[PDB]
C-alpha cells in the first residue's frame, strides 16, 4: 500500500508540472510527440517576437 | 561632517532641485549572473535514498 501511494503522488506531481492536455500527457508520461492534427488541435504555422 | 560628500553643490545646477524632493538620479540596473550552484538542474520531487 505504501508503494501504491508513492506512485499516485508521483503521478499527480507529473501532471502538475507538465499539464494534463492529452498532447501534454503523452509527452510527459510516455515521452512521445503526438501530432496536433491527429489530436484535432489547431496547427501552429509560424511566429515571431520582437 | 565636513568630510562627507555634499549633494547641495550639484543641486544648484539642476533645473529641478532635490531640495524640492526631486531625486538627483534615476538609474536602471540590469544584472546577468552565471551561477554554478550545488543544486540539481531541476528540483523534481522524490528522493534517491530512503
Amino acid at each position: 500500500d505504501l508503494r501504491l501511494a508513492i506512485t499516485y503522488q508521483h503521478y499527480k506531481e507529473m501532471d502538475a508540472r507538465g499539464g494534463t492536455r492529452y498532447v501534454e500527457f503523452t509527452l510527459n508520461h510516455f515521452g512521445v510527440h503526438t501530432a496536433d492534427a491527429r489530436l484535432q488541435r489547431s496547427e501552429f504555422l509560424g511566429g515571431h517576437s520582437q | 561632517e565636513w568630510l562627507k560628500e555634499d549633494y547641495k553643490n550639484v543641486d544648484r545646477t539642476l533645473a529641478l532641485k532635490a531640495s524640492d524632493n526631486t531625486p538627483q538620479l534615476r538609474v536602471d540596473f540590469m544584472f546577468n549572473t552565471i551561477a554554478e550552484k550545488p543544486m540539481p538542474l531541476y528540483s523534481t520531487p522524490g528522493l534517491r535514498r530512503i
Binding site: 507538465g18 499539464g19 492536455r21 501534454e24 509560424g46 515571431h48 517576437s49 520582437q50 | -
Partner: peptide, 30 residues
Amino acid sequence: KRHQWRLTHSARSIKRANIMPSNPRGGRRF
C-alpha cells in the same frame, strides 16, 4: 564608444526570436 543614438531607454536588451511550440511549467500557454 560613448556617443549613441536617441534609441537608448533601458539597461536590458531583448533579442528577436522565432516562436516555437514549447512545454513550460504547467502546460502550454503562449
